[PDB]
């Protein structure tokens, strides 16, 4: 079961600033009243974060999962109904399902056939003075199901913050979270919160794209009021400050601005007056040039190798090879040889070196 | 003929009953010892269980010819898992004859290990045509095992279990049972917490770990606290007392009596290994 909800208003993906959010605990190591620098995939400070609505407007596009993704959903009147993970999402490869409910949560991992519009249905006011849930259409069939445990519920203007960080390292899917009240400020709140990890998943597969899941005939329909944030993580060093209780009360992006760089070098948040040496400066190359002599005659490897008459070992045939273009790829890729060993060089890099003089010793 | 493949993962592979039970007449593993199974981690296991003729159990072992290995179940010589076989005449013997257990008898060619050819279309022994469903040189490829309670040695139904698994191509999620030891404090012990090595003295701590934090480290980034993995509690780690030993001596041509200074060592730990005592004075520089 799946229905294509093709009715939506043409709105481009807006952007906004992710001020000081997205900091989690990179490791399960307690630290007391100390400042620590560790480099991993974090959310950049003062970075631009994608802006999505749900109005009329039903934003649900496929988005890549390149090296961790930050998800925050300032979504009062809960309609968020999980996430989609995998690389193909068409039952050919294993895919991940996460859902939510009032008192239940299911993490579902199977080779799932995902329809182009996967969503969970929610009917409206069936004369029972309450909303009930049914008619969920996220996949079609369960083909190869492997990892399917059930956890405990985690469901806690807008008044709830559901900042989640998803990281997949060595096949381990990591989920971090933090809930705190929000008082107005329609953008990301101006405050620092640390996302404690929730689960670790031994999926062991590749996740390249993701998708969000929301609640709910099909054509000409209006989405419930929602807004969720999508940011992309890249490897950048940080400087996390731990208090006596051991929680990260503040952090500094080691590559944000020169002041942050100096704080990162000094391993301190406050900086005394003076001049501080920092990381070096350089100009990176803009384009790569290659200059070889324009000789066109191919080297005589044909009769060098496929010669019918190979002499005796004490009369090894030494042939002079020079002033020709030698294509070693045809030798390397052809697996007809039982021993293709190079000592001072590598067989794969032979097609990038121009040699002074080459000897061939066939015997 | 109808062996089925099972997916085993996300669990612990303790053999505390599997190997210590006498119900299995042959606990044979061709890649590991029976002792090493619990001390080593493994990967996804494709367990195979079937009942064959007692005189054809040699065909279960790889590198063997015959109807069984050629037609219904072949194994490779590089097998690493465990093959468990015993006698189950009572379990799988029928008074009228347990002919449900079937072995393939005819094939066009010998198959390869881990192959499931359920397709059984027309097979001919000779070159004469074999149309329809019956005819000359059209011999049935399936015969039932002679499993009866009156079967002799080598002819009774023997249950065979094969714990076939492949390694070095998937993340390791299944390990052996993990042991625990009675916890002791205030003593210099060789602790081991969730695989962490090192020597130190356990001590009840005033530190308040967060629920997800299992390790404590100082500015020097060396471990000094650890959360108890059974009864959640934070235990300080302090290196076992050490320090140089200095011998206060006058000149040899004056006297041969000496005094010993255990630098930076409280007098309590001196007699752990002049340990008798009879002269003790704990200064600020040691005992």
């Amino acid at each position: 079961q799946c229905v294509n909800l093709t009715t939506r208003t043409q709105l481009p993906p807006a952007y906004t600033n992710s001020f000081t959010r997205g900091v989690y605990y990179p490791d399960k190591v307690f630290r007391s009243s100390v400042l620590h620098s560790t480099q991993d995939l974090f959310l950049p400070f003062f970075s631009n974060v994608t802006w999505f609505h749900a109005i009329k407007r039903f934003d649900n596009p496929v988005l890549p999962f390149n090296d961790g993704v930050y998800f925050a959903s300032t979504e009062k009147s809960n309609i968020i109904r999980g996430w989609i993970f995998g690389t193909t999402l068409d039952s050919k490869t294993q895919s991940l399902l996460i859902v939510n409910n009032a008192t239940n949560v299911v993490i579902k991992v199977c080779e799932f056939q995902f329809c182009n519009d996967p969503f969970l249905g929610v009917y409206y006011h069936k004369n029972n003075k309450s909303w009930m849930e049914s008619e969920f259409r996220v996949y079609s069939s369960a083909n190869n199901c492997t990892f399917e445990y059930v956890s405990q519920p985690f469901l806690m203007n807008f008044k709830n913050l559901r900042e989640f960080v998803f990281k997949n390292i060595d096949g381990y899917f990591k989920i971090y979270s933090k809930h705190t009240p929000i008082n107005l400020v329609r953008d990301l709140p101006q405050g620092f919160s640390a996302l404690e990890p929730l689960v670790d998943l031994p999926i062991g597969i590749n996740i390249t794209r993701f998708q969000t899941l929301l609640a709910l005939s099909s054509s000409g329909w209006t989405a419930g009021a929602a807004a969720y944030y999508v940011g992309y993580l890249q490897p950048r060093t940080f400087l996390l400050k731990y208090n006596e209780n051991g929680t990260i009360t503040d952090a500094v992006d080691c590559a944000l601005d020169p002041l942050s760089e100096t704080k990162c070098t000094l391993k301190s948040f406050t900086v005394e007056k003076g001049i501080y040496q920092t990381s070096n400066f350089r100009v990176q190359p803009t384009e790569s040039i290659v200059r070889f002599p324009n000789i066109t005659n191919l080297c005589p490897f044909g009769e060098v190798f496929n010669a019918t008459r190979f002499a005796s070992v004490y009369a090894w045939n030494r042939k002079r090879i020079s002033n020709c273009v030698a294509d070693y790829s045809v030798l390397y890729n052809s697996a007809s040889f039982s021993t293709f060993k190079c000592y001072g060089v590598s067989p794969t890099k032979l097609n990038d070196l121009c040699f002074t003089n080459v000897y061939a010793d066939s015997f | 003929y109808a062996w089925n493949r099972k997916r085993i993962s996300n669990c612990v592979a303790d053999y505390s009953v599997l190997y210590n039970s006498a119900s299995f007449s042959t606990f044979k593993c061709y890649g590991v010892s029976p002792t090493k199974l619990n001390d080593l981690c493994f990967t996804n296991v494709y367990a195979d269980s079937f009942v064959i003729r007692g005189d054809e159990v040699r065909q279960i072992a790889p590198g063997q010819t015959g109807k069984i290995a050629d037609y219904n179940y072949k194994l490779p010589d590089d097998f690493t898992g465990c093959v468990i076989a015993w006698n189950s005449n009572n379990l799988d013997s029928k008074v009228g004859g347990n002919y449900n257990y079937l072995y393939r008898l005819f094939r066009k060619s010998n198959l390869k290990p881990f192959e499931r050819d359920i397709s059984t279309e027309i097979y001919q022994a000779g070159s004469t045509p074999c149309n329809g469903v019956e005819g000359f040189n059209c011999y049935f490829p399936l015969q039932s095992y002679g499993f009866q309670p009156t079967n002799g040695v080598g002819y009774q139904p023997y249950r065979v279990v094969v714990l076939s698994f492949e390694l070095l191509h998937a993340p390791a999620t299944v390990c052996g049972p993990k042991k625990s030891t009675n916890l002791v404090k205030n003593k210099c012990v060789n602790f081991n917490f969730n695989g962490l090595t090192g020597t130190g003295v356990l001590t009840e701590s005033n530190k308040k770990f967060l629920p997800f934090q299992q390790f404590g480290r100082d500015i020097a980034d060396t471990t000094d606290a650890v959360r108890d993995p059974q009864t959640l509690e934070i235990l300080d780690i302090t290196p076992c007392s050490f320090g140089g030993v200095s011998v206060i001596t006058p000149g040899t041509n004056t006297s041969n009596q000496v005094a010993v200074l255990y630098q930076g060592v409280n007098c309590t730990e001196v007699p752990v290994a002049y340990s008798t005592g009879s002269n003790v004075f704990q200064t600020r520089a040691g005992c």
């Epitope: 069939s141 369960a142 | 089925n4 493949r5 099972k6 997916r7 269980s49 359920i118």
Partner: nanobody, 115 residues
């Protein structure tokens, strides 16, 4: 417990029969069926195993046997064609999951082909 069996009977050549095998449970989409037949005074031989959505038949039952399953009512129907006297046998139907567990024994119905 057991597997309910029906569809058997005594018929002459050229007739039509439809054996039934229904296994109770809640996971029919993952169930696998293995068939057998046991002739009176003869050996008991495999008939047809329909696993997942794949079908296969033996030498004497290929084309003659048209195996099928009903996902709606957990029913397995085997269309019977080209009756042969030598195929008079008691058919035992088996139901199991992808693991091979949940093994229940079918009683078997009396099927006879008259010469």
């Amino acid at each position: 417990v057991q597997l309910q069996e029906s569809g058997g009977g005594l018929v002459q050549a050229g007739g039509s029969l439809r054996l039934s095998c229904v296994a109770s449970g809640r996971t029919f989409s993952s169930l696998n069926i293995v068939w057998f037949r046991q002739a009176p005074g003869k050996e008991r031989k495999f008939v047809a195993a329909i696993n997942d959505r794949n079908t296969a038949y033996a030498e004497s039952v290929k084309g003659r046997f048209t195996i099928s399953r009903d996902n709606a009512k957990n029913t397995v129907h085997l269309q019977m064609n080209s009756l042969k006297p030598e195929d008079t046998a008691v058919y035992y139907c088996h139901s199991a999951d992808v693991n091979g567990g949940m093994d229940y024994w079918g009683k078997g119905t009396q099927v006879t082909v008259s010469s």
